[PDB]
Amino acid sequence: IRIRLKAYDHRVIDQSAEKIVETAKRSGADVSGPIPLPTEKSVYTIIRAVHKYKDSREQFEQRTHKRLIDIVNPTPKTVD
Amino acid sequence: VEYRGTGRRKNSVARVRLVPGEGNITVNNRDVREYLPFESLILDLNQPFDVTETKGNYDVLVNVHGGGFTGQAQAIRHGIARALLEADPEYRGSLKRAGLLTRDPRMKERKKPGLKAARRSPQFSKR
Amino acid sequence: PRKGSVPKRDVLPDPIHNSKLVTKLINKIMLDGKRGTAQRILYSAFDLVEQRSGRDALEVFEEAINNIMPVLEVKARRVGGSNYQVPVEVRPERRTTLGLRWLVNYARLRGEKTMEDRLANEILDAANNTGGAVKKREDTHKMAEANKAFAHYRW
Amino acid sequence: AKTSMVAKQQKKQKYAVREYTRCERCGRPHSVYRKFKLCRICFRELAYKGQIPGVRKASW
Amino acid sequence: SIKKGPFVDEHLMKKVEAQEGSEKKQVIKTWSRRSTIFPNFIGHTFAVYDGRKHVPVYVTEDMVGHKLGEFAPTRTFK
Amino acid sequence: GQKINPIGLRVGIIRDWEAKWYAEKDFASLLHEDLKIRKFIDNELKEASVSHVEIERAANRINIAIHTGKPGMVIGKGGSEIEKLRNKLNALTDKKVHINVIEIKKVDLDARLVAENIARQLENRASFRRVQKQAITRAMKLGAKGIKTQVSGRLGGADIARAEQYSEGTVPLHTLRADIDYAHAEADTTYGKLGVKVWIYR
RNA sequence: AGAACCUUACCAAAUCUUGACAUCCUUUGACAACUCUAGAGAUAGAGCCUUCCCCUUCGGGGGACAAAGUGACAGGUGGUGCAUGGUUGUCGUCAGCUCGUGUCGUGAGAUGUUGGGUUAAGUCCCGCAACGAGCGCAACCCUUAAGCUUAGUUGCCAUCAUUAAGUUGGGCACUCUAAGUUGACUGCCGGUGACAAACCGGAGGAAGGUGGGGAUGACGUCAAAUCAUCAUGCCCCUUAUGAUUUGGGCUACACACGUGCUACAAUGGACAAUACAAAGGGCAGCGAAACCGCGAGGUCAAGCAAUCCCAUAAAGUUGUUCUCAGUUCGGAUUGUAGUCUGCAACUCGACUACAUGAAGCUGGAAUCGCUAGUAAUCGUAGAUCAGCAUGCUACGGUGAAUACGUUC
Ligand SMILES: [Mg+2]
Ligand SMILES: [Mg+2]
Ligand SMILES: [Mg+2]
Ligand SMILES: [Mg+2]
Ligand SMILES: [Mg+2]
Ligand SMILES: [Mg+2]
Ligand SMILES: [Mg+2]
Ligand SMILES: [Mg+2]
Ligand SMILES: [Mg+2]
Q1: Cα dist. A37→A34, A40, A67, A70, F198 in Å?
Q2: Where do the annotations place Zn(2+) binding (chain D)?
Q3: What subunits make at least 3 CB pairs under 8 angstroms with A?
């Protein structure tokens, strides 16, 4: 079915991935081991000061982590 | 018997194999001598073959990826040394006597914020 | 560097000419990061030596550096509470590196209207004397060799 | 004279592209964003103390 | 400068297209410095500036294709 | 020359965030929504020892958590005022589900309500050095291992301003590991403005 | 980190002064959401459905969309960073700065921080009225540098086979790969510094002696900067030092100086052919393929977040040609004829082909920037943004010369 997960923190998404593969593997389901898609950042380089004292700046990021999980056996014990 | 010689130089991977016979190097279903575009010194990546006391040991039919062209080159030079030492494990004490097998000294670096070319500073006027 | 002796570690092999001291003057004609236009011009300026000179450029080449080879340096030093010059003989690693600039700086000065022919008239006419750049090494060769002065100075 | 301007901007003076974008908790008309609708100094005290998501510091 | 109707402002057209009846001369009072010259223009002035000027500009048979009432300048130099 | 505020660096390795939710497109107006409601706690409760609120969103199931330290008077008469701002904040758009308080014993071991303990004194003109030094000395009779308090703007009835930091203990600012809890409070009465900063270790 | 109008605080013309705004006030129609009159517009008026909530048993919290004149008033991008809070620039990532007990001094004060040696370092040991502590440097944190688990669908294909190539199957799973782990530290090292830490050497981790970079900015100075981000003590404006449009301005000009770009040519130009990246964005946005245009583009139009799109990187290679010239160098300037964004491009954008083709021969006195993926070279992407950057912060490709020395 290939459910997708994406989250800001990085340990949270691995414990969620092992939660969903735990609730899938404890029932009969031939699920793949969870897939790391590359995790994308984006950059916010910004001026610190309030007036015109430029050429003194600092940057920010935010980093979305993207995993991937797919099941190929729709069973009644793996429904939701 | 030699396989899986990875090779890295400046953001340009290269994976190889080594087949016995004679020295015949080839990448990406086309030649080498008229692929490395300027690079008249094609022989100077074959130069570990020069210093391993034997030139025509094996054939390669190698693979390469990414980077520039000499950034895409010169890692084949690195990449056949790992599999070359995996062909016979004697050569670490006898290929690192010219110091050749592995060094990853340098890649490009960050443009420092409020500068122009990552070590250069803009010109300040006077006093 | 007040800390001492940054290492050298520079290497210079070559494809055909079998000489470390020929890949140096490919590294000084190469301006603006274009190594992809140097030996295309250099090796097309050495294969035109034997068509212009009498011989192959190999046995002319060590003569061509040999006659241009600078001898003496004048590194000024304010001695002991005074101020005038001193002759210094160059350590043998530095002297070729000082030496090779005078090929290329006068290569861009001989108006022959073809750089792979204008530059090669200073390897021809360099094994033979009174070239373009031999005039400067004889001008500075007698800078303090004849003008010998306080030669007990340190630096 | 800017609290009149915010009274203009959330209304509409009817042409297509006469509007512009202003800071949410502050009121600057320049260097604002569209990911946040904040602005370049008013973003910074709200990027600190953890209260906005996403934002680690720097230095990748 | 494109195709499709060189963009006379329409209220100016409302004034001129029925203003051209008699032999009277009361010209514009516009201060809309945007419109081009439709070819059916009668002898009249205009008032084309709004900071402080009503410069009466001639409608005389110039190159009428200009997309501007720009015969009235804005500032001085010396 | 500038000490940057130590909460800024110390997120993502030892202190987590304040808004756990994720968004994709609504992050503009949703980022206006939480930043709209995170003043109403400090205004409506009027600081019943309220440290800092917590947002999490779960797709039309919001959950917010106010620490606030002091139970009881935050709640109302057994459950009266809590639903009164459930109803009051539920008129924001369609929100305010499961607000809960988590009390704080060891009162003056946390930066905020210390800074409103000693901002609230000197705005009633309580002679700043006994304002600070007691809030210093209660820290290390309650087990703390570092506090630095500074008060800056125009102390006393003077006409030039000078900052008088009265620190002690151990208060590092170049180790990332420690949970340097920071606060700030700007409060002054009838003779200008004034700033107050408090760093607390542990 | 976007000036056509908007922005916009400036000024000129019309324009109201419980107000374009926020609060209550008394009864509640909602709309000016539409069609028309005038005007440039704000607005000035007429046609409205002149309604509606949420539940009472003829009834009120007043939610609407805001309506009536009041008062409490509101509004200030107006004065000042020498009344301030917050926030930065800097000396300078320099290696210093301070206490708490003592103890000398009538005391301002000093020891502790000094004298031996080492280190980038007040880092380190050996000494001694000092013994310790605290803020600093170091590690802790990101990024990169090589393996093993653990995963595999868009992730790669060789071992097999149809493959223009869709990587279609095989389900192959290793090879990068993409985010989660083992281990660098002066370690056993040879010296000899005489045991003082440490310093020059040899070994084997891919790895040098803080592996390479960032983020981190001590007490404090400069009454440095900001009331125009916001907050703000106090003084002024009070049918105008407020408010709303339209339309000018912020770009004007003999001039003076900063920064940036593109060039003066033949290791250069034109011309067709011809390979190899990283980092990014795109659900009314990115837009393919094939289509009509000299191009700027126009229509339609499937696929869509590693997979799909923008998106050909460019420099260089092989080859043709101009053959050393105010020139087949350069496009500065200047009219016609378009495209696109927009309600509109005159003041005041941008791009294309048609001719026009100026200045200029590597620049006086002087003056900067850089120590290995580094300066230089052509390029790639992004935010800001409808449209418009040579700036800006990010990313790869090609890649040298030089540092014996501390005298100035
Ligand atoms: Mg392998
Ligand atoms: Mg030294
Ligand atoms: Mg105001
Ligand atoms: Mg490291
Ligand atoms: Mg480092
Ligand atoms: Mg540090
Ligand atoms: Mg004011
Ligand atoms: Mg300006
Ligand atoms: Mg394409």
Answers
A1: 10, 9, 5, 13, 43
A2: 23, 26, 39, 42
A3: B, D, F
Residue nearest G384 (alpha carbon to C1'):
D31
Phi, psi for E38 (deg, rounded to 5): -65, 145
Query: Among chain C residues 109 through 138, which have CB within 7 angstroms of nucleic chain G?
Result: 111, 113-116, 118
Name residue, tokens 């910074």. D44
The C-alpha atoms of residue A59 and residue A45 are separated, in whole angstroms, by: 4
Q: Which helix (DSSP H) or strand (DSSP E) does residue A11 occupy? A: helix A11-25
Torsional sign, CA F33, F34, F38, F41: positive
Q: Which residue has the tokens 């009361």?
A: E26
Local structure of F40: helix, strand or coil: helix
CA distance B9 to B64: 11
Residue B83's H or E segment, with its range, is: helix B76-87
3-state secondary structure of C31: coil
**What is the rounded distance in angstroms from the CA atom of residue B36 to the CA atom of residue C15?**
14
DSSP string, chain E: --SS-----HHHHHHHHHHTSSS---------TT----S---S------SSS--------SS-TT-S--TTS------
**Cα F186 to Cα C59: distance, rounded to the nearest angstrom:** 86
Q: In this structure, are residues E57 and E27 in contact, taking their beta carbons and an 8 Å threshold? A: no
Please state the φ and ψ torsions of residue E17, each to the nearest 5 degrees.
-65, -20
Q: How far apart are CA C90 and CA B68, in angstroms?
A: 41
Please tell me the distance from the alpha carbon of residue F63 to that of residue F42, in angstroms, as a whole number.
17
Q: What's the CA-to-centroid distance between D59 and ligand 5, angstroms? A: 12
Per-residue DSSP letter, F91:
T
Q: Which residues contact D18 (CB under 8 A, 6 or more apart)?
A: none
Q: How far is CA B114 from CA D43, D58, F181, in A?
A: 20, 15, 32
Interchain pair B38, C15: CB under 8 A: no
Phi-psi group of F59: left, alpha or beta (phi > 0 → left; psi -120 to 50 → alpha; rest → beta)? left
Check: CB of residue F145 under 8 Å from CB of residue F175. Answer: no
Q: With contacts defined as CB-CB under 8 Å, which chain F residues touch D47?
A: 8
- Mind spelling out the 3-state secondary structure of E2-21? CCCCCCCCHHHHHHHHHHCC
In 3-state terms, what secondary structure has residue B51?
A: helix
Residues 6+ apart with CB under 8 A from C103: C25, C68, C119, C122, C123, C133
Distance in Å from the first CA to the final CA of chain A: 12
HSE, side-chain direction, 13 A CA sphere, residue F194: 30
What residues does F149 pair with on adjacent strands?
F198
B16: tokens are 């190889």
Is A9 close to F16, i.e. CB distance below 8 A?
yes
F15 beta partners: F11
Half-sphere exposure for F144 (CA within 13 Å, toward CB): 28
**Are the C-beta atoms of residues F180 and F147 closer than 8 Å to each other?**
no
Q: And the tokens for A41? A: 């950042």
Q: What is the DSSP string of C58-88?
A: HHHHHHHHHHH---EEE--B--TT--B--EE
